[PDB]
Amino acid sequence: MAVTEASLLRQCPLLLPQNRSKTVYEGFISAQGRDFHLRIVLPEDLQLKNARLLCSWQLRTILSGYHRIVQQRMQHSPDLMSFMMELKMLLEVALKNRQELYALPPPPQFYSSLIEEIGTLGWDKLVYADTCFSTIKLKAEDASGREHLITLKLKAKYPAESPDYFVDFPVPFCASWTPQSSLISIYSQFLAAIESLKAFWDVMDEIDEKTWVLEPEKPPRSATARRIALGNNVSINIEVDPRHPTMLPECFFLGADHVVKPLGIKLSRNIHLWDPENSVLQNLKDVLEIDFPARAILEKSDFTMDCGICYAYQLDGTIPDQVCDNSQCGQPFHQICLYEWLRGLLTSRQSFNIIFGECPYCSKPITLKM
């Protein structure tokens, strides 16, 4: 209704005026299939500028850090009705954030059906399940004998709604979900996606075997990028389109501006001598008329000896100089970059002409003396 005579009742069924002067309400407030204790005193007038409100400890825990929110709301909400609206909205938020605590699943379907469906798959495939039985992660084999993983996130009702599917390979995964579709259906789809990008993987395999792949290390299956160094102190980044892998890639060159020219020129000349029947390397060796080195240095390949903020060497005569007092990070920085980083963070604390504060990468104590 308009008035909070009927709108209140219709929107807060379980809040009973104890008192005749409708000043004390008590009982329950509803939120997300779950009803909770509430004890809401008014003064002699119908004014929330002064009002008492206590919870059960079950609710106060669930309005963890909205306490000040709701005090503000009480002083600046006009009506009791609108205040309840705001409160229910505010619960919905709390629970939707902390969705990790608040399942009762419907066991009769849920836990049994999951065993049924995983049985239908076969017991080799599953690798991880979290004990909330939310996340399950599964394993699939290529024709090429390469492992690819799939995360499923499951909802309260798996068989009703789509599982959320998270997977590695680089084109956007598509799963036709019906309420009739199940794990085997999404499994089949996943195998289809494997066999489809099969060529892209054979190409990336070939590169990572025959050559000094540098900038991804233990590269995922995600990556389209392969910064090859070749001879020494010169490198080419190669980004390949997955559907047409064998096709010419966009490729471009880092190193000495004198050494980059003739290669950049000969590419221009020989680009029409690309062919998609031979491999990327078997086109590149005869296009650029060179060989590559087969891991020219495999230990000190390259340490990005760069700022770790700006990712550049030589910021205004500053070198990556400033480092971490840590064996596991060792990440250089610049004075300027690291000062403008740590001074912005809340964690860091400033002595006279020194900043003690957390290394960006590893969050360990790092000191900067200007």
Place this chain on the structure above:
Amino acid sequence: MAQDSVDLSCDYQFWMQKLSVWDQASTLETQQDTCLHVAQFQEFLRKMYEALKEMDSNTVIERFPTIGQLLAKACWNPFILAYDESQKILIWCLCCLINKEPQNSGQSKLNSWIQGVLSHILSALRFDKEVALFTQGLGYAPIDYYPGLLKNMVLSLASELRENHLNGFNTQRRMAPERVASLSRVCVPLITLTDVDPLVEALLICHGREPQEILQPEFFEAVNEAILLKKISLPMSAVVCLWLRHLPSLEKAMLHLFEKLISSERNCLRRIECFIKDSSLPQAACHPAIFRVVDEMFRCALLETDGALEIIATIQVFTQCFVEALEKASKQLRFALKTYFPYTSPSLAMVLLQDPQDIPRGHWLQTLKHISELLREAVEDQTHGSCGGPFESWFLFIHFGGWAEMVAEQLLMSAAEPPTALLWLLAFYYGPRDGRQQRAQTMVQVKAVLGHLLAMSRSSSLSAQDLQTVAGAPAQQLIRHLLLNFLLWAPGGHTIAWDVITLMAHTAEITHEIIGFLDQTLYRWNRLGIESPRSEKLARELLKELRTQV
């Protein structure tokens, strides 16, 4: 010569009623209002000076009733007194309104009131009491430090606002944005005043952290105008972060490019390369946002005009300068061309980025003939895992000056057995979206005309009617542009050029089209450095003489 007082006497009452609203604008909204309408106030005042200039003082009562109070309100208001020449003008107004020999005491009273107002502007102590005492005692008059003073005030804010940045989530004095807001209203009146640049600079770099904007676009539009008229000249970092946070300024710089190429400087492509490079646009365009938005206003012009050659030329200049500002600043960490032009093959772009200066004049046929073959696959085999459509694969080809234009001049050089690849390519350029039936017909009409033209080139210097026969339809621009190519390439040209030009220039449209053609041809040659001095001097002469005819 029609009105005299009427439009001016109306806008007077508009403005006089509005100055009484604003009145020294010591609030937020008095200021926003002043902030906007000021420009029109300035023009009003130019018209007002002309009106006061022509006549003399104390004698006329045209708006002499309240002009005192209009210029009072104007003056005591400082948001006005910061705008371009408003202050010099209001002075010019008053210079008319004085009398040398006041006779009735009213004129003398006005003159006194004007000395009062001038002193109020020029030499008044409406600033901090302590500093006045100190300096007067020290033996300065305001003038001689006002400057350093100012610069100091600024560098306090400048530096201070820079600090507000560095404290990205620190338990410190968050300089309350209401001050930030404040200044930004103060910078618009005086974007043109040299001794504030730094301030500006440090507002347009240190956005920080708020969900929301905190400046007003009266400021973002003020900045825009003094950039593209080049009356502030900021550092490049400043203006990229400006585009990047008020998108309608970026649209609105691109319009300010279009009007250059459309209205003022039709086909002066050196002045257009000048304007692209002295705009920081190529630069801003390193940023995958800004270029995506640029290309889309470029796309909406490519459609409303169904492929203006002059709009195409300005794209070829934009790409040109984009590539080689992209190239420059991008050794580590640049965004992969499937990010800039995402609607087509990365392969094809990676070919077409390779500039022809740095290729032999002999290996241009190879290159072109390969480009066309892959285009044929991307358009005609429009399958899954390709472009959306042809349009996008053509839009790729446009951006690349050199390649699109060189097909024709290479067809003439291979007129003996024309390659089908180039025929198809060229008919694709001058007509995309045809049906393969239409493209076959276009190729073979051109092949017939290649026979006729090769016969005519290997003959002596002949008439122009023989050429206008083959010219005599929906493939007209194909044939005309190819035939102009013929005239400038063959040594039989430079003789019967005029005969063909005068016939083909039915309208002004055709003339303007061919002017753009020639300027493009010559910018292309001078760039790649490639010349027969015959064709150079000829093209220059014809361009010169045709720009009078129009």
